[PDB]
Subunit: 435 residues, 4 copies
């Protein structure tokens, strides 16, 4: 299988060879390989999507197809590689973005192939190659994505092995990456466990940690549209994405109108105190989160606690305190609690507890510039969406490019090609200021 | 003593308090505190400089005074904090540079107070505070710099403790910083030992590793000016700075002219094979580098092996192979070997071995754009100076700002305020595109 | 008198000589001359201000002193001159901002010395010199400013005649500028008559035309603060500035609260229908605008129609239709009509008529992002201030730099040094891309 | 015929209607219409090219096809429309690029359809429409291009009349454009006569004046490659383009080698003093330039003075003084004199006379950074190409985008969408700085 290897040392070596050609390739040559990856991704997004659902049991196909199309269209390519110039009496100074080399990447089972392909477009654009240690739940999907990219590069004249992976990811294979001297950067896209581990590797780690994104709704909001956007956003790929709304905080005065709209127009099903407890018991085990529930549609989750509901039901909503464990905990499930709030200031405090100091993602619906500003300042997230669904944050219905590696922990924010370069200052003294 | 504390947990706590005021300070308020730090630095550069020489035994006062003046003048302040905007049908998207929080910093005995103050200007500009664990050889100097900054902030209305330090740095106090949960970023300015250690901390580490900067001189160079620039650059603060030229590679045809110029006009003293061996024996011990020699002027080093020379001698030069240990090893001494080369291509290969894969700093004298380009591409350093002394790389006689934390390992290059921020995307959907 | 000449051909020649030195001056040399102009301006703003009031009869001293301090502090200098770089396989391409040469400038009697000095800072920063043909009402003031700048440049090592003027401006002297072959650019800061004339000169004309800036206030606005900001803005330097609010459009529901606040807290005096007609008769003559009224404080204007009012009265307000000639006409007087509006959409239409297709300046008080966006899009002005006084538009209490030459007609917007340069592309083929 | 009208007032009105839809179109909608124009241009470049040659008698088809493909590929679209943001304590300030409206354009018979289409892509990207008054020699070609664009916009959902023209251009129809109140900007791409006329119109004129681009070759140049590049560049589309090399200045020592290479490898034919005089008599008439010679290939021009030469001859070269009228005069003919020069400084002086103060285009072959810098500074052109053919200046084999409207006179340089917008500052006070 193309770009896939029996072990990590082989993956890294192959990748290191290809990178010697990649660092000397023009922008035009890289952009061709990248253009063919975009094309290959679109052509196979149906295959990639059903693979992920079939292998992991999570998410759904129509949303995963859109995810893959967003990656192909809006992931930055070589236009993201830029140069700055200062010139004056003392000459010209240039600052460039040079390659790192072979980058290691650790990728999730939620957006497995989206991450792999987004990372590669970016990383390749900057003259890097990349070696993946994919989540073992999504290994087939992941290595299919890898094989696609090499197909795409083979199509565009080469080289082979711009992206490599291993046939069987383990912890041993990931330990070998993180102590490999040929690898100076690792991008970690995953939970806190893996991110922490890369920032202990002795290499620079770009760390995409977790979150619990709240969405604030105040009384100035368009409430009908707020309902629509929040469910759309929460339920996207069955709540798998890190950015998706996972709990609401509603100003008291409009909280009934919002929730009403949610039931009556957005396919929401309000559960009783009783039903809340059996669902909590289901989705939160003594072992932590229920892997069998993560990324499951709401009809399926309701069905699992013996509640039969119409096929047009797509989200479980209820009103609860912020400590409610379906509210305080990141579930990656179309399960959305509403937390009622006395005041905007109380709303901000509740939202901030709920975000859990992650400074990952948070959302607001308000038409009031002071309100937005207040919330923005206090919540201090890598991402803030105002009056749209969360996925606007990655260019689905909002300005800006797509990524799947949001580096909230180590601070690079929404990663692109430029993230994965080294800065190089070039000082041409006392010449080449033409003024 | 102001900003200085008995232990690291106290340092960090004080710093964390001040940062709560700093993150809500305007740019104008930060820039005032920064303006007063610049002023305080200039007023006390004579004191800072003689302190460093007196405490460490290294460098010299006139050059250290200039180093401090460069920091005050050319370290970026709040103008380095920038914002990007994308607007279109789907609204306005902003990307901002938000504070990290309390940054930890580990600083050297070579440019102790320069680093402390440069870091602080940058870090403060971005809404951070900073806690230092200074090199223990330069603790007095370092903590004097710290106390100055708090004086400067006290002068500008507060707050106290924007920069903190410890009375007695140790390895215990640095371990406490690197495992402190209140600290998400550490800037490490030092050798590979300390940098490696911060990249194992579980936090993002900005890593300023070591080097061995070569300077290539070809036959198109202005040779008389190349002589002048290289000695000036090599001998600056007795070769302490990471960037300074520490070995030459000369195209054979002009190597005699260069070296001749060096002796006859630049205060160089050519040593014999005999004298080379006693100096190697002196400056390289079974314990590694001779701490008693590092940063010593050439008259002093010559004197230590019983060679008496006129006061106008400032650099030891000789012709040798690249493996010669005064040539291959970073000495931080005004000791500069010349390596003769058949051809430009041979010159590039020699220079590349000598740089030792650090991708730190390298230099060239050539008037030929293809030559410069060839060398630049192959040497791939964070810094490349063409036809000037190395310190042009930090704005002394070259375009661009000053830093003392050149992050060659982790890839941020010449650090400034913007380095020490987190990126924040703000998506204002379907409003505030005024076009 | 320094920089001032008997005739325009002499002015231009002297300016052309100085420019030969200016185009070869470093940024540091220009910035020194500029730094001394900033300093000289502050030191003499009291003199400049009382000169203008005393010579023209217009405005007031305290506000003119602040105007001059804004120019000194916030007019961009040589940091406004920037360079862009594109590098790739085909080499390096630079784009620079090169000088025009000798720029001609035509300046107003409202902000005479502010314009002269702002233009010069900018123009000098870019390697130009400048020749002024000052408004004849403010010739003394204007040529004093000129003489100051040459004093400032003399102080900083030269050259003399970076700014020149004529002892006696006329129409003949301005015709000679506009047909002078040594002058490729003219900046026209004045009414439509002079701007039109420069755009007929055969040279590039940068055209700062007139306006009638409306300020919209809706029901979401902070009304008490809206009152404060609008009077402060309208009455600044007795309404002389082009940007200042000159009429209000108020959403009906809060129009009484706004106007009430204006009378009770902002020193406003509401006039009756009767009093409106005698003031209209006063300030609008068969000859057009009453030169004896322009830039007069409200107590003085009220007094002129025999209405005695307390010294604490600073603005004349009344409610009227938009066609009311104190509302529809730019008066440059602290005379501010309020136009009541059924709805936001009606408010936008009224404001748009009132702006008169100038696309100059307009203002809004609203906390609603859709409202702001709607208004912004429809009014389409070079300048839009939201929830502040108009002078925020030039950095008094708002982000961004200062100018006094707002080129609304020819489209360059708020002029700075970069405006007054020529773009130069430099294509270095197949070299100096170091990546 | 689509977008073409019987008279100019109709053209302008139709254009003004379409622009009301264009100013409210998203970037995505504009970029679709633009994408279809790019596609339509490529599909019909063979038709456009042979039309121009057949109608004007000038240039050649293979080069015109490449010209059209460069326009389609490298003319900037809506990515050229950008936004700047400043945020701080006082809020957020945005600067946008808003539409002008209906732009008038005057276009040449040399690159008729290239100009029309390049202008339109740019102008449309910024929310403008455009009305053309095409050169009457190339009216069919020009109006075919116009009709294509409307075809392209019709294909992409509309609107019709984004570009308009007249069936029969005259001076009356161009006078009506230049005095039309619905038109605030005119782009003039043509000789000095038309540019001067637009800068007398009372509107902002963007003025693309003429030139005489010299190419300097010194002794450090790659001479064989210099020969190749200069002929390729000079002879491109039979020397029609404004940018093309039209005379050489050669350092004496390598001038024979260059010229030798030109004859022996580049299809050059050296003419005698005798033959020079009959060609001068041919191509320069008492009426000025010979319209029957402009843009004719060298075999044809040689043939016209009775000199029969092989089909492989593409350029007429000779050695002459700089005043030689085939050297000093812009001919737009593959006629290239070599001017021999004592020294680089003499070479620079000769080149500068030859450029004739146009500050249009100039070229150099030198590997020496000080040489390039010296020449660049003294020649001060909108365009400078180093070591490539001139057409690198527009992205054929050099970094940067394509244009056909190089505004050398009025200073905007290489025009793109951003040129044809008005700047708009938006000051959001004391809100929407999220930091």
């Amino acid at each position: 299988e193309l770009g896939v290897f029996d072990d990590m040392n082989q993956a890294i070596e192959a990748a290191k060879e290809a990178q010697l050609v990649v660092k000397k390739m023009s922008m035009d040559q890289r952009e061709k390989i990248i253009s063919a990856i975009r094309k290959k991704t679109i052509e196979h997004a149906e295959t990639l999507a059903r693979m992920a659902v079939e292998e992991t049991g999570m998410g759904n196909v129509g949303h995963k197809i859109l995810k893959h199309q967003l990656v192909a269209e809006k992931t930055p390519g070589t236009e993201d590689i830029t140069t700055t110039a200062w010139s004056g009496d003392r000459g010209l100074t240039l600052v460039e973005m040079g390659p790192f080399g072979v980058i290691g990447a650790i990728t999730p089972c939620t957006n497995p192939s989206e991450t792999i392909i987004c990372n590669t477009i970016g990383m390749l654009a900057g003259g890097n190659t990349v070696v993946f240690n994919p989540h073992p739940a999504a290994i087939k999907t992941s290595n299919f994505a890898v094989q696609l990219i090499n197909e795409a590069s083979l199509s565009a004249g080469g080289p082979v092995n711009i992206a490599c992976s291993v046939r069987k990811p383990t912890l041993d294979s990931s330990k070998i990456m993180m102590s490999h001297q040929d690898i100076p950067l690792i991008a970690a896209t995953g939970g806190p466990g893996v991110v922490t581990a890369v920032l202990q590797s002795g290499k620079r780690g770009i760390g995409a940690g977790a979150g619990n994104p709240p969405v604030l709704v105040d009384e100035t909001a368009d409430i009908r549209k707020a309902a629509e956007d929040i469910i759309n956003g929460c339920t996207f790929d069955n709540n798998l994405p890190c950015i998706a709304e996972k709990e609401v905080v509603a100003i008291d005065a409009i909280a009934n109108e919002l929730m009403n709209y949610m039931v009556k127009e957005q396919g929401c099903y309000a559960i009783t105190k009783e039903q809340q407890e059996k669902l909590t018991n289901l989705v939160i085990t003594p072992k932590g989160l229920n892997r069998n529930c993560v990324g499951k549609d709401a009809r399926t989750l309701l069905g699992m606690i013996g509640i039969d509901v119409p096929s047009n039901i797509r989200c479980i909503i209820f009103e609860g305190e912020k400590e409610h464990p379906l509210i305080s905990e990141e579930l990656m499930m179309p399960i959305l609690g509403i937390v009622r709030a006395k005041s905007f200031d109380d709303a901000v405090e509740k939202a901030v507890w709920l975000e859990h100091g992650n400074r990952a993602s948070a959302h607001i619906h308000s038409k009031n510039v002071d309100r937005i500003t207040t919330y923005a300042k206090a919540i201090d997230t890598a991402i803030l969406v105002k009056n749209a669904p969360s996925y606007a944050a990655i260019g689905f219905g909002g300005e800006g490019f797509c990524t799947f590696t949001i580096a909230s922990r180590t601070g690079e924010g929404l990663t692109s090609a430029s993230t994965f370069t080294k800065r190089r200052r070039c000082v041409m003294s006392d010449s080449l200021c033409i003024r």
